[PDB]
Design a binder for this molecule. Structure first.
Ligand SMILES: Nc1ncnc2c1ncn2[C@@H]1O[C@H](COP(=O)(O)OP(=O)(O)OP(=O)(O)O)[C@@H](O)[C@H]1O
Ligand SMILES: Nc1ncnc2c1ncn2[C@@H]1O[C@H](COP(=O)(O)OP(=O)(O)OP(=O)(O)O)[C@@H](O)[C@H]1O
Ligand SMILES: Cn1c(=O)c2c(ncn2C)n(C)c1=O
Ligand SMILES: [Ca+2]
Ligand SMILES: [Zn+2]
Ligand SMILES: [Zn+2]
Lengths: 524, 145, 48
């Protein structure tokens, strides 16, 4: 570090170069370990910082529980979320990702088994799909009561009965394995958001949140429990509120409010936050059809919709229906009224044309009943290609001839041409827009620096120039390793920077991330 | 190698007309636009072939009695109550039509499943032909666009 | 097009000051910076 810290700080020194060059088995041994950041260090001028990256933590920014959490976060902040909480959303990501890298290290005999399932989750939900093809390939051979036939050999229908009871087993081993891989994380982001709300702000003492914000009201059941911050690493949050609010209000009211055999009020609260978590319910519904898959074999054909949740350019299709969805109900709400408004006119003038019959000798079928004339238009008039002039007798020799051409030629030119274009239009332009936001993030991170926010133009200006600015000088992984490194340092051991940062991290100002300039934007 | 095969049959000199494709510019672009965006194309036809399958399981397990490609019952009536044959009935007739599946299905009027079968058709038109066969054409034209 | 003009007004008022006509870039430059320029310094209700 010392040989580095002069080469970075003082260039144009020929004495140091031959001095540096004989240490090349050392500097090119430690460059795996030499994490560099840049901060605005207390003097209104920006200086480098050098530290130690451990090796048990360089190999846990692999292990794709974390890399899944990175690519969700990176797409989260740079899409929406303004500058006033950009970096505050960064440190709120680095706080959680340390808890994942502790969870990744620990991943009677039951504890040995339970870590086999949380380890192999992504490699087991993939197996729960390949079985569901082999059910819905075998199930294609049915014939009519419904008995299966064979085409290959005699041993076909037992292999369905084997692969069906196997599928309930695997789909039960993918909500066990989900229960010990992601549920401890969503517990942690819930406990932080309650512990950092009653303490730094106070709501169960001062605000008392209303009947709106339901998840505020459910959190009231956990503060009376004993082992409250079970994952939030901060086991003295109970005493910090008493020393903060025990004098404006009673020291006895707070101690009533706060405080083989297990805690029961916490365990009732832990399940209360799993079942409203959105990604867990799909893992339940994917399992509860498997139990229903033995009452009838066809229910393993609803497991093919894991193609939808399981890919990327098919997850976007499924999301495009409800992305623009609020304008969608209001338009179908207009389409169902215009077709109704063309049913009142057709009922009150034109009963005599509506014959779905066969040439009059048949006891002719009519559509002179209001609800049945209504469902005649919605089922035949919309879905046709020419409007309503198809299933209506040809008007030629009639008193209402011109008064009925107008009734058809608007119907085609007001419902099928217009109103069933901007129904398809609000779905395709949803998919045409949502596939662009996931392309801008692919671009907005490759022509801008994340933490500086500078640009590819200024930082290029040398051969191979943006690459080194994001692989040495910022490299936002390093800003997470740095805040992992402060924790293992003793508080007496903090150097000059590492206790101006760590003090600022407690008060949470975040003025020390380099806002505008980096290093080369003030030197030369 | 088609020219050598062009003497075993004269029609094989009609596969040499595709040198119009490799040989121009604004027709080389058409040919390349199919596979330029092609990775999202298989994943979507991979969804279209599953939704139509998922509407075959429902139609097989509830609605055999409507699927008559026959002539008025005195004919030894043709059915579609066989799973693979009901599947290729939807992929060949239900997609390529203009109104979904309410064309080659008998008109449901006096039935116990009347409202439960309008819903089976009006989604099929509003989930496969309107949506899913727009963003199949959409991934080809916006590739060329 | 008409659903876009009602989206630009939703944007042209949230990345510009109405009466200054300055922009979100210059007035941000501090933590929480455009919000106070339009809730104290101009806030066009106050001019009414
Ligand atoms: N501050 C930054 N930190 C890291 N990367 C940055 C930063 N600013 C811009 N980038 C760009 O973002 C890219 C990082 O995204 P990239 O996809 O390469 O990550 P990855 O290691 O490939 O993992 P994944 O593909 O899962 O995201 C870098 O190549 C870099 O060009
Ligand atoms: N000069 C300005 N005066 C007021 N608002 C401004 C001005 N310049 C920009 N703005 C932006 O316009 C927004 C005001 O529109 P906003 O929709 O918030 O009004 P509102 O109080 O919510 O009422 P309504 O929703 O009915 O318009 C402010 O939040 C501000 O960000
Ligand atoms: C113990 N501990 C902390 O003390 C801590 C932390 N993050 C911030 N702090 C302050 N983490 C993740 C942590 O485990
Ligand atoms: Ca010291
Ligand atoms: Zn930078
Ligand atoms: Zn102004």
């Amino acid at each position: 570090v010392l040989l580095t810290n002069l080469s970075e700080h003082m260039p144009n020194d020929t004495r140091l170069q031959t001095f540096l060059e004989l240490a090349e088995s050392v500097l090119n041994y430690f460059q795996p370990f030499l994490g560099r950041i840049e901060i605005m260090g207390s003097a209104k001028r920006i200086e480098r910082v050098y530290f130690e990256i451990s090796e048990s933590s360089r190999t846990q920014w692999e292990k794709p529980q974390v890399k899944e959490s990175k690519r969700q976060f990176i797409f989260d902040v740079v899409n929406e979320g303004g500058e006033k909480e950009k970096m505050e959303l960064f440190v709120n990501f680095c706080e959680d990702t340390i808890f994942e890298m502790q969870l990744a290290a620990q991943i009677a005999y039951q504890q040995k088994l339970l870590n086999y399932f949380a380890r192999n989750f992504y490699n087991m939900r993939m197996l729960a799909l390949f079985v569901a093809f082999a059910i819905n390939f075998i199930l294609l051979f049915y014939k009519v009561v419904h008995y299966v036939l064979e085409e290959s050999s005699g041993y076909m229908e037992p292999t369905l009965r084997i692969l069906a009871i196997l599928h309930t087993v695997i789909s039960f081993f993918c909500i066990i394995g989900y229960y010990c891989l992601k549920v401890p994380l969503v517990i942690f982001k819930r406990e932080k958001e309650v512990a950092r709300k009653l303490e730094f702000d106070g709501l169960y003492i001062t605000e008392q949140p209303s009947e709106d914000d339901i998840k505020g009201q459910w959190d009231r059941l956990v503060i009376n429990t004993q082992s409250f911050p079970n994952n939030y690493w901060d086991k003295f949050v109970k005493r910090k509120v008493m020393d903060k609010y025990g004098e404006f209000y009673g020291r006895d009211r707070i101690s009533e409010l706060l405080g083989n055999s297990i805690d029961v009020k916490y365990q009732m609260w832990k399940l209360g936050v799993v079942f409203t978590d959105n990604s867990f319910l799909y893992l339940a519904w994917y399992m509860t059809m498997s139990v229903l898959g033995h009452y009838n074999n066809f229910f393993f054909a609803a497991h093919l919709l894991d193609i939808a949740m399981g890919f990327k350019t098919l997850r976007t299709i499924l999301s495009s229906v409800t992305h623009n969805g609020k304008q969608l109900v209001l338009t179908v709400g207009l389409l169902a009224v215009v077709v109704y408004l063309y049913t009142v006119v057709a009922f009150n003038f034109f009963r005599k044309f509506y014959n779905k019959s066969e040439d009059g000798d048949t006891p002719d079928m009519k559509c002179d009943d209001m609800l049945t004339c209504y469902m005649f238009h919605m089922y035949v008039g919309v879905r046709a290609g020419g409007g309503i002039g198809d299933e209506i007798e040809d008007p030629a020799g009639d008193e209402y001839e011109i008064y009925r051409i107008i009734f058809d030629i608007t119907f085609f030119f007001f419902v099928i041409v217009i109103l069933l274009a901007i129904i398809q239009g609000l779905i395709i332009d949803a998919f045409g827009e949502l596939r662009d936001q996931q392309e801008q993030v692919k671009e907005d991170m490759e022509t801008k620096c994340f933490i500086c926010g500078i640009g590819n133009d200024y930082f290029d200006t040398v051969p191979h120039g943006f690459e080194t600015h994001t692989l040495q000088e910022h490299n936002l992984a390093n800003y997470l390793f740095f805040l992992m490194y402060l924790i293992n340092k003793d508080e007496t051991e903090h150097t000059g920077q590492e206790s101006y940062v760590w003090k600022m991290y407690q008060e949470r100002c975040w003025e020390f991330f380099p806002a505008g300039d980096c290093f080369r934007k003030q030197y030369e």
